Amino acid sequence: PTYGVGHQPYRVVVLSFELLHAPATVCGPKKSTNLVKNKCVNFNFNGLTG
Amino acid sequence: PTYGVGHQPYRVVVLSFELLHAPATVCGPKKSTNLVKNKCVNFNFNGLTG
Amino acid sequence: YAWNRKRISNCVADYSVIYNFAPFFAFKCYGVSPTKLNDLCFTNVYADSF
Amino acid sequence: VIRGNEVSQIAPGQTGNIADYNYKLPDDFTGCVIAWNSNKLDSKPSGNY
Numbered sequence A, B: 001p002t003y004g005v006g007h008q009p010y011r012v013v014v015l016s017f018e019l020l021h022a023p024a025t026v027c028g029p030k031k032s033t034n035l036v037k038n039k040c041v042n043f044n045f046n047g048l049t050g
Numbered sequence C: 001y002a003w004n005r006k007r008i009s010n011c012v013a014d015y016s017v018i019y020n021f022a023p024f025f026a027f028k029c030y031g032v033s034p035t036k037l038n039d040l041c042f043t044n045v046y047a048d049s050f
Numbered sequence D: 001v002i003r004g005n006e007v008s009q010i011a012p013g014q015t016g017n018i019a020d021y022n023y024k025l026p027d028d029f030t031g032c033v034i035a036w037n038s039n040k041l042d043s044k045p046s047g048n049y
């Protein structure tokens, strides 16, 4: 503890995400909505918005 | 006081300046110069130079 | 107001041993990169301290 | 756990000691890094070994 501020221990946690190429396993909190067809809508499929 | 360095209180002051559209009211110590005309000069009117 | 200037010439500059000498966070450089200081090399170094 | 000088070494496209021989990140990295001080939990007056 007698060291300076440039020599203190630092705990590092690195979160590495894999982008969506496979089926999604981990996903954030969002409320699902029933599917509609043959209408111009705004879709959010697994984080892909259009 | 026993909490970590990221959970400390922080005093925040946000200074929002609104831009010059009205007559200017609040600004600092720049010494004014007498106005001369009919000559190519460098003018500084309320902060805008030319 | 009376900062000290030192000339560094005719030696072999190891910049990887600066870090364990003073407790500073960032080796803030402008025209070069701190990790690439050994591959490229210079003519003269001037060190100013205040 | 690293020291304070090498926190800037955990970044894509870096060289040194941690980024060359200990922990290397890819150039196409998509993710976050969280580093915080541990002067109380990971430090001893006699020296942490």
Ligand SMILES: *[C@@H]1O[C@H](CO)[C@@H](O)[C@H](O)[C@H]1NC(C)=O
Residues within 6 Å of the ligand: C020, C021, C022
């Ligand atoms: C600071 O420089 C002195 C020069 O005599 C040296 O003895 C000492 O080891 C240096 N400090 C560190 C932390 O290397």
